[model samples]
Target: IVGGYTCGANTVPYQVSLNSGYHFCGGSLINSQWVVSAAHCYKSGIQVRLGEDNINVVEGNEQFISASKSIVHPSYNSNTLNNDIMLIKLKSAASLNSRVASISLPTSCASAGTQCLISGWGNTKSSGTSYPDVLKCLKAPILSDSSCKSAYPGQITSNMFCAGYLEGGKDSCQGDSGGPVVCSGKLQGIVSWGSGCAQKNKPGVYTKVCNYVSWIKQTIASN
Candidate 1:
C-alpha cells in the first residue's frame, strides 16, 4: 500500500464510498468507533465504505462501516485546500478481523527524512485515466524541514506536511488528495496537494495529523 499500516501482509487498498460513488483510498482504524480519512473526502452527504473492492463497493470480503457522522477540520478552506483532514464516526463499532483491523497512527510522523507510504485509487500513469479499482501504492521519503520550507515557503504551515519524491512518477494526483501518508506504522500525514500529477522535483504534501492531535482527541471525546 502507499502509506500507513496494511490491513494484512499485503497492502490491500480500501475504497472511499460516498453517496456519489467509489474511489480508491486508504484509511486508519484509530479506535473501534472511529476511522480517519482526509477532510477533502467530506461532502454535504457523505458515507465511507472501507474494506471493499470495485464499484460495487457493497461486494467485498470486508464489512462496511457506516459513519454516523463525518467531521471535517473546522479550519478547512476549499479555496486554499487548507486543513484537509477529517474523521468518520462509525454508526456501529467495527469488528477487528481479517478483512478489517486497526491501523496504527504515527507518533513522530512530523520528522522529515522519515520514509512513509501513500496508497490510493489514483491514476497509475501520470496521464490517461484514473484507477478507480485495484489500489496502487507508493513509498515517499519525507523532505527535510528546510526543503519543505523552500518548496512552499509560505504555504508550508506547521499544520501541513511534505512527502513523496522529487523524481517524477512517484507522487499523488488529483484523486489521491485526501488519502494518507503513513510512516513507521503510524500516520504522519493526509493527502493535501501536489504540483502536478507526477512532476519531478515536486512531492505530494499532506496535513500533519500530529499538529492537531490535541484538537482531534478533544473533538472525538466531546462529539
Candidate 2:
C-alpha cells in the first residue's frame, strides 16, 4: 500500500503473500484451507506464505504452505478484469495461532462512506515505485458507485468498488493486487485494479467480495 503505515506483527494475521519464488500478489486466509485473492494473480507453482510481515525476513511465526488448487471464478475476464476473484485451496490446513488466522467474509455489502483497511507489501511510491519489505496498510473509505463510474467511464462494474481519498494520498498499488480490503473485520473486497496509485479520481478498485459470497461457499463446499 502506498503512503501507508507499517503494520504491526500479527495485526494482519489473515494477510498472506502469493509467492512463486518472490512476493508478487497479496491474499487473505479465509479459512483453514481456503485463501481469497484476485483471479489475475493466478500463476503456476504458487506457494502461499501466511503470518508474514517482512517478505525478506524469515519470521519464525510464518507458515509456508503449498496450494492444492488455484480456482479462478468461472466467468473471469482477463481483459476487462471482471469476476477477478480467486480461491486457493491449501495443501494443508493452516494452523490457527495468534500470528496466523483466517478472516470472515462480509454478510452484507459495504456501502459508501464505510471505512476499510487495505494491507499489502506492494509499491510505496505513486510514480515509478518500490515494494515494501514489510507489510503496510492504508485507511480507505468506500466511494459511491455513481461517483466512481465518472472516474472510470464504461468501467466500475457492480462486482467492483472504489476506496480511497478523492484528492489522492494513500492507497493500495501494484503488487498489492488480490489483497484483502477489510471493513469492520469482514473481508469486503479484493484489490483488483486501478488507474494508478493514489492518483486523482483513481482510488484503489477492488472486487466486491459480497457479491461472490454464495459462489465462494458453493465452490468450497463442492470442491
Candidate 3:
C-alpha cells in the first residue's frame, strides 16, 4: 500500500489475507464461506485468514480457514486482465461476529469521482519488497472511464476501472492484489493491476466487481 494508514481493530471486518504459509494476496469475505478476489491470484492450497488486523500476530479475532474450492471467471483474459475476478469457497463457514463478517456485493456500480476505500497488507515502499504486518488503507476516487482510458490508452476496459489520485502517491501495491476497493460499504472493486505502484498518471486498476455479480452468484449456487 502507498500513502496508507494502519486500520483500527475490526475496522475493515470483511478483509482477509490469501495465505498458505505466508500472505500472498488480499480478498474480501463476501459470505460466510465465500471470498472474492482477483482471478490472477488463483492458486492451489490457499488458506484464508479472517479478522486479520496484523498479519504477523496471532490476533485473537482471527479465523484460519482452508479453501474447499477456487473458481476463476471463465472469460478472464490474462493478457488484457479483463474479467479478472475469482471466488474461493471455504472448507468451513467462517464464524461471523463484529470482528469478522461479510461485505455485501455492490448494489450498483461505482461512479466516477466517488471516494472509495482500498485496504490491504501489501507493499508500502510501493516496491523493494517488505510487506506490512498490519493492514493498510487509503482512499482514492473512482476515475471516469475517459480519464482511465487516457491513463493507459487501449488498456482500460469496461470490466476494469481505475482509482487513485492523478498526482499519485497513494495506491495498492504489489502484495495488495486481489484486495478490496470498497465504496459505500459495498465490495465494488478488486485490486488487480497497476503501473509503477503510486506513480503520477498511473492510478491503480481494479476488477469492476459490479460486472461479475451474475457469474459470482451462479458459480456459488452450482457448487
Candidate 4:
C-alpha cells in the first residue's frame, strides 16, 4: 500500500501475497480453495502465499499454494479496466487458522464515505525504488461516485468504485493490485487501478465486489 505503515503480524489474516518468480500482487482468500484478486494482475506461473506477514523471507506460518485455475471476469476490459476482478482456484484447500483465514464477502454494497482498510506489501510511494517486505495497511474513506468521476472523466463505471482522500496521502500502489478493501468487516472492493499512487484528487479505483456477488457464487459452484 502507498503511504501506509507496517501492520502487526496476522492482523489481516485474509491477506495473501501473489507471486510469479517475484512478488507481483496481493489477494484475499475468499474460501479454503478460492482466492479473489484483480483480473488485470493475472500472469502465468502465479502462486500464492498465505499467513505471510513478510515477503522477503520464508515464514513458518506461510502456506504456499499453486493456482489450479484463474477465472477472470468475462467482461473485463484491459483498456478501460471495467469488471477488473478475477478468482484463483487453489490446487488444494488452505488450512484454516488464526493466521490463515478467509474474509467474509459483502452482502450489500458499501455506502459512500465509509471508512475502509487495505493491506499489502506494495511500494510505499508512487515511484518508490523498493517495496516493503512487511505488510503495510492504510485506512481511507470511500468517495462518492460523482467525486470519483470528477477525477477520471468517463472512466469510472457502475462496476467500479473509488476510495481515498481528496488531498491524497494514502492509497494502493502498483504492486498492491488485487488486494482487499474491507469495509464494515466485510470484503467490499478489490484494488484495481488508479491514475497514480496517492496523487491529489486521484483516489484509488477498485472493482465493486458487491456487484459480482452472484457471479462469484456461480463461478465457485461451476468450477
Candidate 5:
C-alpha cells in the first residue's frame, strides 16, 4: 500500500484481508466460497475477512470465515516464486450483496503499459512501522517485458510480470502479498514479491493471472 490512497468502503468489494490471528496478507474473492491469493500466503490459522475496509474494527457488512481448505499450485516454487498462486475454500459460503462481491478472472493477458489498480492493507511507507487500518489503493502501469526483464535479468519468467513506476514512487509492499491487481475490471495479477517497497528502478513483481486460467478453472471445478 505504499504510495497509495485510502479506498472507499465497498468500492473494491472483492478485496479481502487474509488473517492468521493478525492481518498478514490480502486476497480477492472469486466466488462465494472461494478466494484467490498467493501460495506464499498459506499458513496455519489462515482466515478471510470479507466486506471490510478497516481491519481493526468489525463492520456490520463484514464476515470473517475460517479457511476449510487451502490449495496451492502444484508447481509453486518458493525459492523462485514461480506459480505463486493459491485458492482458499471458505468453511461456509459468503453471502453476496452490494457490500460483498466477486471479481472476474482475466480473459486475456494485460498488455504492457496498461493501467491497473492494486489495493491492500500493507504498510503505507517503506520505513513505516505500522500497517494501515483501512485498505489503500494505487494505480500502476504494467511494465514491458524488455524493461521488466532488464530489472531482474535471468529471473523474469512468463509466469510473472512487473508493474509500477520506473522511478518507483508507488508500489505494493510487505503485507500486501496475495492481493489483487485489477486491470479493466478483471483480475490480472496477484501481489507476489518485490525487491523492496517502492524502490527506484525496481517495479513490483506479480503472479500473472491470465496464464493460469485453465488451471484455475480445473481446480475450482474439481473442488
Candidate 6:
C-alpha cells in the first residue's frame, strides 16, 4: 500500500475520496496537468489529489487540485457501462518536483497478455471497506483481445481494453475503479470494470488510452 489523503486516514493507493470522504475509487496520473479516471467517478464538488504516499485530510505533502473541468465520454452509459472514460483537467499543471510528477501514456501499448501493475486505495477484499489510507498494488496479466472478447463476446467494445488474473485473488477490487493498468512503464489501460473483484474468468476492463489518443489531444487543445 502507498500513502494518500482522503476524508479519513489510511486510504489505499490510486484511490480518490469523494462526498466529504464517504466515497472512494481508483485513479491514475496521466500527466502533470491531468488525471485519467472513470466517468463513473464524476460527481459534483469533486477534487483529485496526487503525489503522496501517506495521505491526510489536514496535512500532507501531496497537493489537492480542484478540477478545472471534467470531461466524461459523450457516449458514457452508466447502465450498460459503455464509454467509461473521463479526463480531469487540474486547476493548474502539477509542479514536477523531486517527489511529484506525472506518468507517461503509452504510444503503442503492449500486445495482449503482457504483465502489468495496478495500484489503488480500493477495497482489499472484494466487497470490503476501503483501506483507511494505504494504497495497495498488485500484478496481473493482460488478456488477449480475442480472449477478452470470449469472456464477454459481443459486449467487449473496440473502445475498451482488458486485463486480469484468471488465477484469482489478485485484482483491482471495489474501490479500484479508475485506476491505471501500467505495462512496460507506460499507461496502456485503465481499471474500469469487472463482474466482481478478483473473480475467476473475469477481467478488469479499462478505457484503452491508445484508442482515445485523438480524443484526448483534441480535448486538451480545445481547452
Best by TM-score: 2
- Which residue pairs clash in candidate 4? none
Per-candidate Cα lDDT values, in order, are: 0.66, 0.92, 0.91, 0.91, 0.92, 0.68
Please give, for residues 1-223, the per-residue lDDT of candidate 1 as tens digits. Answer: 2222223322543333343345534456676777777776776544555565454444545556566888888888877777778887888876656555566665554577888777766666675664555455677788886777777667777777678766666777766656666778777887777676667666677888887777778988997
lDDT of 5 by residue, 3-46 (tens): 88888887899999998889998999999999999999989778
RMSD of 4: 0.9
Clashes per candidate (backbone, < 3 Å): 10, 0, 1, 0, 0, 20
Candidate 3 residue spans exceeding 4 A from truth: none
Those runs of model 5 whose alpha carbons end farther than 4 Å from true positions after fitting are none
Higher TM-score: candidate 1 or 2? 2
Model 4 ranges with Cα > 4 A deviation: none
Lowest lDDT sum, 10 consecutive residues, model 6, at 1-10
The lDDT of model 6 is: 0.68
Residue 203 error for model 3, in Å?
0.4
Write down the TM-score for model 2.
Answer: 0.98
Clashing pairs in 5: none
Clashes of 2: 0
Candidate 2 residue spans exceeding 4 A from truth: none
> Lowest lDDT 10-mer window, candidate 4?
122-131
lDDT of 3 by residue, 1-223 (tens): 9998988878999999999789999999999999999899999999999999888888689999999999989998999999999999999999999889899998689899999999999899755767779989998899999989999999988898999988988888998999999899899999999888989999999999999888888998998
Which structure is stronger by lDDT: 2 or 3?
A: 2
Collision count of model 5:
0
Better of 4 and 6 by lDDT: 4
Q: TM-score for each prediction? A: 0.84, 0.98, 0.97, 0.98, 0.98, 0.84
